[PDB]
Amino acid sequence: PLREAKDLHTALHIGPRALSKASNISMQQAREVVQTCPHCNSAPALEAGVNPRGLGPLQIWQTDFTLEPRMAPRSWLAVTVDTASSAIVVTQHGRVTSVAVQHHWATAIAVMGRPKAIKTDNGSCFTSKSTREWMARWGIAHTTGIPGNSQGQAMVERANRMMKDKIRVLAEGDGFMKRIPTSKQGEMMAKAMYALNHFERGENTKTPIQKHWRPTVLTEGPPVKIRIETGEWEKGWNVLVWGRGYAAVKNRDTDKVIWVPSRKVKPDI
Amino acid sequence: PLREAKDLHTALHIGPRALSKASNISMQQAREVVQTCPHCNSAPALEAGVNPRGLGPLQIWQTDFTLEPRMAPRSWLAVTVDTASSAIVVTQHGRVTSVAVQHHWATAIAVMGRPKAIKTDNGSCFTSKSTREWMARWGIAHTTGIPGNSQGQAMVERANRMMKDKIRVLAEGDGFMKRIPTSKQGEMMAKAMYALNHFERGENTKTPIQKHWRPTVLTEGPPVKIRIETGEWEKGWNVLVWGRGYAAVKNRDTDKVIWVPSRKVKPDI
Amino acid sequence: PLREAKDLHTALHIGPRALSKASNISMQQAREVVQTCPHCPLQIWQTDFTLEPRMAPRSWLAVTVDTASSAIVVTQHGRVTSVAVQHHWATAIAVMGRPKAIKTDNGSCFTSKSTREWMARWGIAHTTGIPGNSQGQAMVERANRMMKDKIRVLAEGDGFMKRIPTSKQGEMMAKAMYALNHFERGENTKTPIQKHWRPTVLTEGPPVKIRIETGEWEKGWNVLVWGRGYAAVKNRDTDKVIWVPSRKVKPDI
Amino acid sequence: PLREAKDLHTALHIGPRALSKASNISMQQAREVVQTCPHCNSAPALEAPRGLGPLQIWQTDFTLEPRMAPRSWLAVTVDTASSAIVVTQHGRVTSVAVQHHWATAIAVMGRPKAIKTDNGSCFTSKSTREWMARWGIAHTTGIPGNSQGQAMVERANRMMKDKIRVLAEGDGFMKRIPTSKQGEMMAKAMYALNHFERGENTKTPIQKHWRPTEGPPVKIRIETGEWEKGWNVLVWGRGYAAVKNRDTDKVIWVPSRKVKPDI
Amino acid sequence: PLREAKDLHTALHIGPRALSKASNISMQQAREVVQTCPHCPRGLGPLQIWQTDFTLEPRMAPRSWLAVTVDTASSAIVVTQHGRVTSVAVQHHWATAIAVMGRPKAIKTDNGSCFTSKSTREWMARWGIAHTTGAMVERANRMMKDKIRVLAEGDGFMKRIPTSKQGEMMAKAMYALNHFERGENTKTPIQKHWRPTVLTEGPPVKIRIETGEWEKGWNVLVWGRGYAAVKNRDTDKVIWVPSRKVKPDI
DNA sequence: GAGTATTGCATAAGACAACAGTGCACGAAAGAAGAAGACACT
DNA sequence: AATGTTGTCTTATGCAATACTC
DNA sequence: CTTCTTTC
DNA sequence: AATGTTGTCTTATGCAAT
DNA sequence: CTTCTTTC
DNA sequence: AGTGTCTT
Numbered sequence A, B: 001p002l003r004e005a006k007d008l009h010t011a012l013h014i015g016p017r018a019l020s021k022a023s024n025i026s027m028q029q030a031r032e033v034v035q036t037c038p039h040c041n042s043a044p045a046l047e048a049g050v051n052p053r054g055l056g057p058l059q060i061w062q063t064d065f066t067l068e069p070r071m072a073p074r075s076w077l078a079v080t081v082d083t084a085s086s087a088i089v090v091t092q093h094g095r096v097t098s099v100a101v102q103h104h105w106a107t108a109i110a111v112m113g114r115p116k117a118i119k120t121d122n123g124s125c126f127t128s129k130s131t132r133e134w135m136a137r138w139g140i141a142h143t144t145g146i147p148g149n150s151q152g153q154a155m156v157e158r159a160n161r162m163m164k165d166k167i168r169v170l171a172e173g174d175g176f177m178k179r180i181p182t183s184k185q186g187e188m189m190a191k192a193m194y195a196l197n198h199f200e201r202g203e204n205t206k207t208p209i210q211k212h213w214r215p216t217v218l219t220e221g222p223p224v225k226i227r228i229e230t231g232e233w234e235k236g237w238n239v240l241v242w243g244r245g246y247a248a249v250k251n252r253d254t255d256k257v258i259w260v261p262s263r264k265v266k267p268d269i
Numbered sequence C: 001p002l003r004e005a006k007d008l009h010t011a012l013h014i015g016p017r018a019l020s021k022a023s024n025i026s027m028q029q030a031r032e033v034v035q036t037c038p039h040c041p042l043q044i045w046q047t048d049f050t051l052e053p054r055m056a057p058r059s060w061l062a063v064t065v066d067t068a069s070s071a072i073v074v075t076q077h078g079r080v081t082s083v084a085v086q087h088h089w090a091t092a093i094a095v096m097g098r099p100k101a102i103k104t105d106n107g108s109c110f111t112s113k114s115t116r117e118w119m120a121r122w123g124i125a126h127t128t129g130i131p132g133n134s135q136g137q138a139m140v141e142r143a144n145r146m147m148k149d150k151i152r153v154l155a156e157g158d159g160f161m162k163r164i165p166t167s168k169q170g171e172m173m174a175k176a177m178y179a180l181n182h183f184e185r186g187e188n189t190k191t192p193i194q195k196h197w198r199p200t201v202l203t204e205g206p207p208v209k210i211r212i213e214t215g216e217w218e219k220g221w222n223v224l225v226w227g228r229g230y231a232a233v234k235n236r237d238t239d240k241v242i243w244v245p246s247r248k249v250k251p252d253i
Numbered sequence D: 001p002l003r004e005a006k007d008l009h010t011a012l013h014i015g016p017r018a019l020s021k022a023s024n025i026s027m028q029q030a031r032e033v034v035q036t037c038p039h040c041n042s043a044p045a046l047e048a049p050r051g052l053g054p055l056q057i058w059q060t061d062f063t064l065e066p067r068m069a070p071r072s073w074l075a076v077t078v079d080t081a082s083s084a085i086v087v088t089q090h091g092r093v094t095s096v097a098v099q100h101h102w103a104t105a106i107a108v109m110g111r112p113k114a115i116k117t118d119n120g121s122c123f124t125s126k127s128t129r130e131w132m133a134r135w136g137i138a139h140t141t142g143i144p145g146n147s148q149g150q151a152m153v154e155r156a157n158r159m160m161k162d163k164i165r166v167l168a169e170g171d172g173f174m175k176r177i178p179t180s181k182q183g184e185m186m187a188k189a190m191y192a193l194n195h196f197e198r199g200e201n202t203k204t205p206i207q208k209h210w211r212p213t214e215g216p217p218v219k220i221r222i223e224t225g226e227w228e229k230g231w232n233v234l235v236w237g238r239g240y241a242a243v244k245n246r247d248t249d250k251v252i253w254v255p256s257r258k259v260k261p262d263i
Numbered sequence E: 001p002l003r004e005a006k007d008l009h010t011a012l013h014i015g016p017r018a019l020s021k022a023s024n025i026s027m028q029q030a031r032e033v034v035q036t037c038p039h040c041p042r043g044l045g046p047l048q049i050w051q052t053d054f055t056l057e058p059r060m061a062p063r064s065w066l067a068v069t070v071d072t073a074s075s076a077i078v079v080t081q082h083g084r085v086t087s088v089a090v091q092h093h094w095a096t097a098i099a100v101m102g103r104p105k106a107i108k109t110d111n112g113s114c115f116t117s118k119s120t121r122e123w124m125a126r127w128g129i130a131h132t133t134g135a136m137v138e139r140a141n142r143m144m145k146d147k148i149r150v151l152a153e154g155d156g157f158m159k160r161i162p163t164s165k166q167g168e169m170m171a172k173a174m175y176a177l178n179h180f181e182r183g184e185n186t187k188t189p190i191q192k193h194w195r196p197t198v199l200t201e202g203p204p205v206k207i208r209i210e211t212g213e214w215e216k217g218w219n220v221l222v223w224g225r226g227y228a229a230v231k232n233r234d235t236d237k238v239i240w241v242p243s244r245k246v247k248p249d250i
Numbered sequence F: 001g002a003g004t005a006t007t008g009c010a011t012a013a014g015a016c017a018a019c020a021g022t023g024c025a026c027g028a029a030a031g032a033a034g035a036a037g038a039c040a041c042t
Numbered sequence G: 001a002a003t004g005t006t007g008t009c010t011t012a013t014g015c016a017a018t019a020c021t022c
Numbered sequence H, J: 001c002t003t004c005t006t007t008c
Numbered sequence I: 001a002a003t004g005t006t007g008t009c010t011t012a013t014g015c016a017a018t
Numbered sequence K: 001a002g003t004g005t006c007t008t
């Protein structure tokens, strides 16, 4: 049956259940036949990726431009968020230039303070010599991303949800439909980012401004296990941050801290 | 604090968790406040009951065109599947014409038999008076689809993902990567259709041939309950088909048969 | 019924038994209608070539007939090659399944190594012989006459005198196969499709066992519905139907 | 839209509710327009409301219209529930002309349960008895001109006459309406008095006749915590329900928890 | 049920769908009844496009000409009689069918001198109706003639029908076609015409548009299991969309 | 009074999203409406 | 050089407190 | 006889 | 007029031999 | 001192 | 000297 099944899959590439039933082969073997085939293994998962987040506020920032035509003429919205505090700062601009990046960054620093590093995309206004000189002056490390995959920029584009879903609702509330009047744009914006920092975020236990100015940093965390490349669970780690998607775990022997998917962490003892 | 919370949401449109905590209101009330707001319409009521299925073999067919450049210059693949037996029939054509549709349906009839009804999407070939007058002589019911949002012919469009992949796997297996030579295209077709229809489809207990020529039609099914618009569970129904996604259920008092989502059916007693 | 049957024969030229059954007409009338018309398993297969000047440019027609179910499969070609035999055979196996053996003539297209290894990978026996023996090559020959007759008859019925353009050829062969396969032939009271597949509609489910309160597995049940969480199984004797957890059901034998 | 509405009434003499809706004019203005019209002050008014639905009890009579000569006999039939007027012209009041008129009224409004007529000669004949018996519609005679048996059609006749007269005076027909335009004129009057709103109601008469198509009803819990009657639910999907107010037909969506059966 | 259907067909020769609904009979019996009798592309909105055509029937002498107009969407029909072929007859018949059904938006006609005359030209413009003059129109003519033969031979009229008997049979025909069936359908032409309109206003909905956005401003007119018919409040355009693509407005 | 249906309420339990600068660009196919020359109108 | 995000949306259980039905 | 339009 | 669908895909659980 | 390649 | 539907 094993050779007959191999020949059958060679010619027809029959799935494993059919070969297992037809030739009376156990499922592990039939699956082994599909696995050993080069063309039929065209769907392995091989998925991973952590945003990542910072262990404390004013450490990791993310910034990107988004287009909200309601703010016309200055329809470009530069959005920035701290990964630890989840607090949002936004300004309006008419053109996406490095001047707008250093201006917006100047405002966000004027509100929340100076961050350790800002994580942007591969845009031309962020990769300009002038921007590198600006962050060279303010001492902020620069981290770009994949060319076209904003998944790593997730928790800033996630902000672009609120900033665009809150501006819609608040603008419709004051009776503005096609374009927000220029006299009330500042009020709209101020109330907008006012509602998203001093007040909780749905099921969030604290407010983003409280998580900003009064963050929770564990000195030494509780012990956890992590699932390592071979699929095994390894003791000897402690967790410092455990969020919804991902957790930050620290190795006990070195104090190195890494971010891993939640599914790959379980309590140690 | 019902009015205080309402005012807070009026101005800032604060979520229910925040208003419930801030104004000490129970959950149901705060949620009612968010619900009662028009510009915060959640909504999210989109009726999920959606069922494109038929009862018996040769009763309801699905037919659509798709592009696979491996068969060029005749790369146009016409696909027709029987919704009850899941038996696929595909024919290659250089250009999508009503004559090509009548040729395809002529072959699928020459293999499976004359169907009672065929459901397609409203294209140029199907909505022509010529194809209409062709189904006229053969007595086959014609059912078009929504202009653009083709999610109902899915069990044929999904068939393309079942089809074209089995093409590639058979093409790469024979050393043909870019375009399959004209001499072996038809053999590729026959080998694909024989691999799909004459063997189990993954977890399928019967083969499409065993499901077509030896189908299983229940004289009368076991009793079930269905969840009705008000959310209640109503007795007095019997289930005739219970698949992975959807179920066909029959009303005991009238013998009227309707299709409903699996999640909306449970055993009666 | 008389006019409906006449129209049916006009278009498809269906034999008299099929028209008699379909339109509920007695034998003498249906047969008289055929007279009044001017133009009127899986054990061993017989494959042969036949040329039809009416299917130009690709006028070669490959025919395969099952010796037990009398099915008919046809594919058009432009020239007889060793590849054409394996292509047509691939189509036939795709249609009606893999047979056990095929009988052909002493032609080079059937006896070449290119065809031999093809029949070897699929496990199909082959026995050649005299080109036209009565053991033999007689049945597939009758299939060729029937097929060519039906081709010229349906063609001249739709208004195609001698040459059918390249567009409607596959449609012609399609309708021909439909008539000669899904309808009764001559005086035979069953269709070749029914002779090949035995289309028995299953009135119930396959047999299963259910785990009873004492933990034992009890035979004598068949399952009719398997929904989320639970399964409906029917007792074959009393026809009582009960619902039980999926985990409490396993195949019987 | 004041001038457009004025022109509309000039030609068709449409009631105020219809002009108010068609040209988006407030009620007080439209009513002032109807007041300023001379033939809208004759008037007469046919609507003057039981609890039975359409096709329950009809009324049928004959009236004279010398302008419609030679076919000067107008057979009028109106519904006592939906208030729909159907009329055809004849040369003489016969027993077969009532079968023709009623046969016409069947093809447009369906078959009623009964038809109340007077003691006229053509209503108690043998031919009318055969036709009425073939169509299975009940019939009751009565006194010609009392206050209960013959109530609405008495006004319906003057409605029709003082409608065709006015629509004809607008085209230049004063002494006698020509024969080639008899059915055309009559048709214009019917389309003016059936498909359009007349008086002040919540639905147009043509809608009044064709809505046996509705809620359970339901009650909804209003902001003050009270339960308010007067709504019907038309759609109940996952999470929310659409309910319609019976007095206005306004439809709003509310949470499922806020709905319970009314009575 | 068998006797009720047989009597109904004996007198009116009613099609099988109507007898099946009226007497609660399955399709096979009613169809068998229609068989035993010897004398026996979809549209999107009513009152929008009509199709008028002339037809001749010498049995209706001296006014042998007829005139049939059909609402193509709601499967409606209306017929009148005329003596000669002129323009005032066309304007007369249209003026009647308007009162029968309601002011249509456009009416398709045939090639003819009566439809192009000056008076007929500006008559439709006076009522604000479009003229196009554009296969399946003549079905209503034979539709009318077969039913006329059915009821005429039902009451015993074989020869030429008197002038004082034509109208009653016309109304008997139009009633015998509008209220019963169209031969194969599931809903009477009246509900296809008169009762999508009686719905005052549906509930508000949003629809997901090509760009993925949700657009306010629509009301739903028909809500079935799979699909809903929704009407734009600003334009009255009606489209059919998947249930999953609709959510409540406010 | 005592058993019980039901209301109040709180999580939790699967999920659904849309965030990515704008999406409209082109093409075939089948069917319907607008435009230039010709020979009647007057 | 440099990784997918949470903010909500409905319904499904487990336990106090009215409002009922004997 | 062109474009113009609705779908795939 | 006319309804998001399944065949894989990985990693966790119940019946019988060294 | 204009015209391409990158990315958003 | 003005235009008008029909053919395509």
Ligand SMILES: [W+6]
Binding pocket: none
């Ligand atoms: W070629």
Ligand SMILES: [W+6]
Binding pocket: none
């Ligand atoms: W070639």
Ligand SMILES: [W+6]
Binding pocket: none
């Ligand atoms: W070729």
Ligand SMILES: [W+6]
Binding pocket: C053
């Ligand atoms: W030759």
Ligand SMILES: [W+6]
Binding pocket: C053
């Ligand atoms: W030759």
Ligand SMILES: [W+6]
Binding pocket: C053
């Ligand atoms: W020859």
Ligand SMILES: [W+6]
Binding pocket: none
């Ligand atoms: W020859």
Ligand SMILES: [W+6]
Binding pocket: none
């Ligand atoms: W030759």
Ligand SMILES: [W+6]
Binding pocket: none
């Ligand atoms: W020759």
Ligand SMILES: [W+6]
Binding pocket: C057, C058, C166
């Ligand atoms: W060729």
Ligand SMILES: [W+6]
Binding pocket: C057
């Ligand atoms: W060639």
Ligand SMILES: [W+6]
Binding pocket: none
């Ligand atoms: W060629």
Ligand SMILES: [W+6]
Binding pocket: C057, C058, C078
């Ligand atoms: W060739």
Ligand SMILES: [W+6]
Binding pocket: C078
């Ligand atoms: W070729």
Ligand SMILES: [W+6]
Binding pocket: none
């Ligand atoms: W070639």
Ligand SMILES: [W+6]
Binding pocket: C166
């Ligand atoms: W060719």
